[PDB]
């Protein structure tokens, strides 16, 4: 199952493996046990180039995990500034609330990510 392999390749940041799997049509919207897509996993780990290739390939920028987080939630929570910018450019929803009622902005505030919180507020 190529979707399962793409999830792990994206999580571990193996750019060559990501390219081979996508060249074989691995499902870019596959989900892991927590409902995370390859885009969620690359956003969480901070793999900017993998985020970018997934966005050029029709990954759902606003897919939600089992806790209601989008990839932008993860990037805002853990402080991935460049990834926040590319997700916003690709149409990430700044108003999406997770199952704790938090937007990406709220997660940026809660985690002390001041520059990202400013970027998200200007995009509100």
């Amino acid at each position: 199952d190529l979707g399962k392999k793409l999830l792990e390749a994206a999580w571990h940041g193996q750019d060559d493996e990501v390219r081979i799997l996508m060249a074989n049509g691995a499902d870019v919207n596959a989900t892991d046990q927590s409902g995370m897509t390859p885009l969620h996993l690359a956003a969480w780990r901070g793999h900017l180039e993998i985020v970018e290739v997934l966005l050029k390939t029709g990954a759902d920028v606003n897919a939600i995990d089992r806790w209601g987080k989008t990839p932008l939630h993860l990037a805002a929570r853990i402080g991935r500034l460049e990834i926040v910018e590319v997700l916003l450019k690709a149409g990430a929803d700044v108003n999406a609330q997770d199952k704790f009622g938090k937007t990406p902005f709220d997660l940026a505030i809660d985690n002390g990510n001041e520059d990202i919180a400013e970027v998200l507020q200007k995009a509100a």
Binding site: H12, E17, Q33
Partner: protein, 197 residues
Amino acid sequence: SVPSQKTYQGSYGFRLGFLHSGTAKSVTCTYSPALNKMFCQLAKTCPVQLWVDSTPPPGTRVRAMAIYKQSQHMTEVVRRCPHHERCSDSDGLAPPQHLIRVEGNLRVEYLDDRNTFRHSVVVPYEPPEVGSDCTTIHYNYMCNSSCMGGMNRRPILTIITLEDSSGNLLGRNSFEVRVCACPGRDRRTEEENLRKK
């Protein structure tokens, strides 16, 4: 029973991360995502990162245990070979028979299960340091995969369990391990074999 190896991310969304260490001639620990397999040299530092989607509560513990990967060997306890068990190389915390050690943590505990006789090593879970995304544990593997009195060329898995203070399951992940002289060469060889099969 035979220890479970099933991935269970659980309520805390537990994943493992590893460094990007490559396949150079002198590399001491390297992880292949395509094989889900760590290649490392005997006694060298093997960083394993704990990534959680939410912080498990104080009192959570992190256990590591080795099992044989092949079904016909899975019921045999993974132990160090007699030569290495007798070579007087304990750090003063690890029993000399245990394959897996943790370095750099004075709160480590080593367990010999009274019923299954399996070995494991457990540390308290601590959240990431300020500015850090993950919690790192430094493991050491104390025999080569090829040790004839021990693993005797049989592949093993390491199972990492997040547990509550009572030992109840919170999350589980696993990876194959080869302990060898030349982890970079062997990673490159096994990745080539996989790409050809």
